[PDB]
């Protein structure tokens, strides 16, 4: 009593209800026709934050207790390996637990359908590499950079009618990023007060402080200090003394600090031609440290060769309406800093919120110079292939690879449930344009019939479709060779 | 009580929990290997039961509010027109039902999923397509007549090492049967004397009574009179039509029977009344009421009337009859538990071999019809439009489970058997099947197991057609009172 | 429960529930897509039975306590005279009810309203001249006699794809059925009792229709020609006409609206594509343009050839206003003392 | 039973019943027969507050968990743009999701039902913009100034009987307000006193040449004024005494943004309902002038409009289905300036009246209720986990 005792039959469905409570509330997110989902929380929680992206809300926030948590897990290694432009990874290891019902049928060990799995990894040898894929992603690029899957992934948000061209922007974002040393530190800011543009692009790092209206406007051969420590009237002098013979020697800057500070110094930097950032983000600082080539913060003695101090250009502009300043111009270039002046219209915020898949969606198409036909080109393809497939393998392994074959076919179905027009005459055109021979036809929402994807512009990246065919085949395996989800009891 | 109200999802689910009940007692029944079983009820039920063919449980009892009964009053209409081999037709259409839980998923139109029994003409032709079985029973036939598919009904059967023999008996009767003088006037019995045949085949309707140990040996030119009331005049007027037999159902009076003797008629005591009426239709009948009832009101066949005595006991043989619509066997055997089970297998057999001879088709059996089957469907729900697919693809995979079930009542690892068995199937051979002897696949032609063509036709009619009507009705069967 | 004696608000939603709940059974009914729909009952029933015809059934049986049953005895005067075409007239007089929820937030007498169905009178007379109306006919005809219609009567049944054969083969009747005379036997396939003789009754509603095309000597255009037209019209009639006699006018041409998507929705594409493309062509002036289910869009209805009798439409229009008109001015139906 | 649990029908209705629960409160609100409410929280409040203005009120209190909020957040939006008149744009959009009965029975996907909003834009421009014309009012200008917008947006506040005066006045303070430099500048307090004319401009600042204090009917406050520079000047209200009195602070501070909005717009449309009935015609036509998709989503967007015209008929007493039938008559017919006469009872010139709204009113309201309700359809539920 109260150990955790699921029994024979019930402890399967725990896995089978975790993937159908799942699949619903996503379905409505992929393609253009997707939807914003807001979720609301309070204490720690600001405000109703508003996530498009199904990965990054699912394990924010652990709602309840069924097993679902680590599957949602994975999906992150699946995100750094190339994130995300629609979240369909989950839909499809959702959708091959129904056929588990059926697999009670068998009567048999559960186990040899396991081989199917085998043949799933060999699935994916035939789902992978059959007919088309966009080939050849150089380096740089002035047009194949943009305007395809980004949209793609910005056409599930609505956002679009004027984000597109953000979309187009973080792809400039990505080839500075190149060279040696992987995605690091790059950070962004959705800034209120509108533009058409919805977005300048700055060169360094933005940091939002001003030591007052005094002081000199610009620095050149910059050094910046960092301090952990923050800053009869002439012993007062003495402090201010310290901080300027070793300033000058240095020939310092900048001066920036987490803390509050002593305004007697703020008077002597105005003069000296050095400015300096009170209270400032320790966030900013840590990245900074990657950036500048760091230092370590200590008492006065921190002047000097016991910090270092990059220098190209360090001022403060006007971006939008609010002073932020930047700094730019690091040796090392390992990290980046990308700038976004918004519209301001409950659309912006989520400009923030849209670029953060920015990193994710076009680093891999980067790296990968593979994708696949969207708009469900690669589904019905596959499944034309893999019905015919199960009465070629021996017998033991057509079972499994049959069920899975049959999977295919709902998902053209669910492309065109959403488009407004039913499915049932979707998918005989569909079939009939793909057993044809032509990769490019696929479903074409807004013709309500079938058409030609690569005008449209959508493709998906080719590591999502072949990661997780291996990997939702393996991690449904796993699910269903484990009879009971044990719980272990109170504490 | 008025019409039950049922809407949308819980309307349904009411005739989802109907076909599951029904499928897992029949699911041992099938084949060779197939379970004997025993019901008990109570009011107006004496003790236990046991019927290996599953139709003639059903039509007997209809225990329960869920629908159900309306299907299985069905099959009989499948018996008067084939219905019989083995019991089949109630589980395939029961896994129809499965599928249904996906339906709510497509969230759509379940009207237009119907269109998937267009489709079931398809499923006429390619559950049937599966390669070439038979082809001739031109009519009667000296040699094609049976040593096939009646014994295969018999195989599932404990009586199989002589009543094969008995069950080829079983033709000649559906010979006499076809035509349309309706499914009528079968009489079968068994006897306690013992023979290596095992049965006898007679011309005639066979009675067993006896006026008295005087009266004539036989009668020829005979004319029949039958009386509703009994005896308890006559020499008269039954002189005048030449009277050659009597035959009463109830008492006979003393007074006439001395009479009867010299004069040369034979009457026959107590007779049955289910014997009499199936009689005036073979003899045109007549209408009877009093004494009266002689002459021209009553209608006599005549060729000849006489008692011989079988071997072990006395009997009385009526034959010729000129309208020739009704016949009867009279069998006998050897004195087993296989004996009594003859009566089993002839009420079987009589309906398998009548359509055997009208279907001009036959199917393999041992699940041979079932594998192919499933792969030829597989193929086609991709290639029609998606949502009638989606039906159509489900009800492929229910064919998967029949193999299954076969060496599973065999004794044999179903799992090993099921990968075996479709390679064969798939390569083309029409004769190879399951071998629950052999443990793995064969030669089914071998064995002599095959199918009627019909009762593969109405097992699947039954589950598409009339399935169109099943998301569409909405209320269904209860009683018929007093 | 306890004693049931319903008064004003609830005491309206009875008739209300009454006619919503046999909406949902015959709605599917109409339209080129339908559902056969088969009943068994208990005491003196014998089998399932179909009958695609909603107003007989209704008349077999009287199933539960609301107040409808009288409502659906009348049905089948309409069928004497003319009777079916589609089973629209219970659905579109339950119809008037749901718009009755906005009238309690208008708060201002709900009788003025009902003085409308007076005024249904110069909605009767609106539906003439919009109807769209053919030449043609020709008295016997070699290929207009059929193919039209009757087929939109099975449109919406099942059976359509082998039905809409023998469709055909019932204008062969009404044309031996012409002259000095006024209104042979012709043998269905069915389940097997009193309720087959339902079919009877049903199937009364389709002999006649055709015998009033080869005699009426007008006909209209087919396949929602008709109601999109009507529809255009109508909205600039309200806007024609005093406003106490346009309230009643313009909420009755709304109505019209509704016809196109039922038609379109069934064919098997999106139910709204349809909406904006058929008013276009109406609009434009060309009365032989119409929904095209097979296409999906608009296209000609007279190269279909699917035409509706004259009679249909002249009677279905003043029939609607009269039916409706009684259950407004009309009490609860109860009271008077021993109960 | 006895828990929060969303899916299905009931995920769609918490946004249903938070749209109707609001619309019977402001209902009453709008037209010149207009109703103001009284409010009571015990919770850290004072007593009693009362907003005829159904932007204030929706702002300042979030009683419950289910959304609307949000929702009310966008209109004060519209009122920097514009705002007021008549609170109209909350109503129109309560009503919008009353349909999605009829949606349950579209048997398709509601989010193709959602490019309505899309259609809404199309829909909303076409009648704004082209309508018949104002023709006049150059710069300043002596008697065309006013007996316009003021009066209408008044109309649905009860003190009309004699603060359609007070509206006249208004358009005063703007013509010295407009010129080279900033909007704003403008302070407005109101005197417990009574007298005809009901109010009082002043050259300089009132603060409770020449500084002194004089004596305004009852309080004690003091007048700096006659100062050199000329271009800044303050404006003193005066009133009869009640609830409605107090609706003058958010009043004014609304008047201002709106007025602003007339001088460079250099445009107007007819009010008192004109607007609305004329879009209603030309909207019926061209959901059926659009493609098809476009189709369900603009012909549901169209009969949003039927509901203003008896909203404005419904306050004045007289039989709304009336109204609506004669309504449609003279706009159909193509006079403009005919509309909703409600002291009439029935129908009449509307530039006679002078009644007239700011281009602006219906610019902003249509764009942004395409995209803001988009974006809330967008969202079902709104998942909460609770904290703190």
């Given at each position: 009593a109260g150990a955790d005792e699921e029994r024979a039959e019930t402890a399967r469905l725990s896995s089978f209800i975790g993937a159908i409570a799942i699949g619903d509330l996503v379905k409505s997110t992929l393609g253009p026709k997707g939807m914003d989902k807001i979720l609301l929380s309070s204490g720690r929680d600001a405000s109703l934050m508003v996530t498009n992206d199904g990965a990054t809300i699912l394990k924010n926030i652990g709602v309840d207790n069924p097993a679902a948590k680590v599957l949602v897990d994975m999906s992150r290694v699946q995100d750094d390996e190339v994130g995300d432009g629609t979240t369909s990874v989950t839909v499809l290891a959702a959708e091959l637990l129904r056929e588990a019902e059926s697999l009670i049928a068998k009567k048999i060990h559960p186990q040899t359908i396991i081989a199917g799995w085998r043949e799933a990894t060999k699935a994916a040898r035939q789902a992978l590499l059959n007919s088309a894929v966009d080939h050849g992603s150089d380096e740089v690029k002035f047009r194949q950079d943009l305007m395809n899957i980004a949209g793609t992934t910005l056409s599930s948000k609505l956002l679009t009618h004027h984000k597109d061209h953000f979309t187009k922007l973080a792809v400039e974002a990505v080839l500075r990023l190149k060279g040696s040393g992987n995605l690091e530190a790059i950070h962004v800011i959705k800034k209120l007060g509108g533009s058409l543009a919805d977005s300048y692009l700055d060169e360094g790092f933005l940091l939002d402080k001003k030591i007052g209206v005094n002081q000199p406007k610009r620095i050149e051969n910059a050094k910046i200090l960092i301090a952990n420590t923050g800053m009869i009237e002439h012993a007062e002098k003495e402090k201010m003394k310290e901080k300027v013979e070793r300033i000058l020697k240095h020939g310092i800057n900048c001066f920036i600090n987490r803390q509050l500070i002593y305004n007697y110094p703020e008077q002597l930097f105005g003069a000296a031609g050095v400015m300096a950032i009170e209270h400032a983000d320790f966030v900013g600082v840590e990245r900074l440290a990657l950036v500048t080539g760091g230092e370590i913060a200590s008492t006065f003695d921190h002047p000097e060769l016991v910090k270092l101090?990059?220098?190209?250009?360090?001022?403060?502009?006007?971006?939008?309406?609010?002073?932020?300043?930047?700094?730019?111009?690091?040796?090392?270039?390992?990290?980046?800093?990308?700038?976004?002046?918004?519209?301001?219209?409950?659309?912006?915020?989520?400009?923030?919120?849209?670029?953060?898949?920015?990193?994710?969606?076009?680093?891999?198409?980067?790296?990968?110079?593979?994708?696949?036909?969207?708009?469900?080109?690669?589904?019905?393809?596959?499944?034309?292939?893999?019905?015919?497939?199960?009465?070629?393998?021996?017998?033991?392994?057509?079972?499994?690879?049959?069920?899975?074959?049959?999977?295919?076919?709902?998902?053209?179905?669910?492309?065109?449930?959403?488009?407004?027009?039913?499915?049932?005459?979707?998918?005989?055109?569909?079939?009939?344009?793909?057993?044809?021979?032509?990769?490019?036809?696929?479903?074409?929402?807004?013709?309500?019939?079938?058409?030609?994807?690569?005008?449209?512009?959508?493709?998906?990246?080719?590591?999502?479709?072949?990661?997780?065919?291996?990997?939702?085949?393996?991690?449904?395996?796993?699910?269903?060779?484990?009879?009971?989800?044990?719980?272990?009891?109170?504490?």
């Open positions: 101090g990059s220098c190209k250009l360090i001022e403060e502009v006007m971006i939008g309406e609010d002073k932020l300043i930047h700094f730019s111009g690091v040796a090392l270039g390992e990290a980046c800093t990308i700038v976004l002046r918004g519209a301001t219209q409950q659309i912006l915020d989520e400009a923030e919120r849209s670029l953060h898949d920015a990193l994710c969606v076009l680093a891999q198409t980067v790296k990968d110079s593979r994708t696949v036909y969207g708009g469900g080109c690669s589904e019905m393809l596959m499944a034309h292939a893999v019905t015919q497939l199960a009465s070629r393998t021996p017998g033991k392994e057509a079972v499994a690879m049959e069920s899975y074959a049959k999977a295919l076919r709902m998902l053209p179905t669910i492309i065109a449930d959403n488009a407004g027009y039913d499915s049932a005459d979707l998918v005989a055109q569909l079939r009939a344009a793909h057993s044809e021979g032509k990769t490019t036809a696929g479903l074409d929402m807004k013709e309500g019939t079938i058409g030609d994807m690569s005008v449209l512009g959508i493709t998906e990246s080719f590591q999502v479709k072949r990661q997780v065919l291996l990997s939702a085949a393996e991690a449904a395996e796993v699910i269903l060779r484990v009879d009971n989800i044990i719980k272990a009891a109170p504490r």
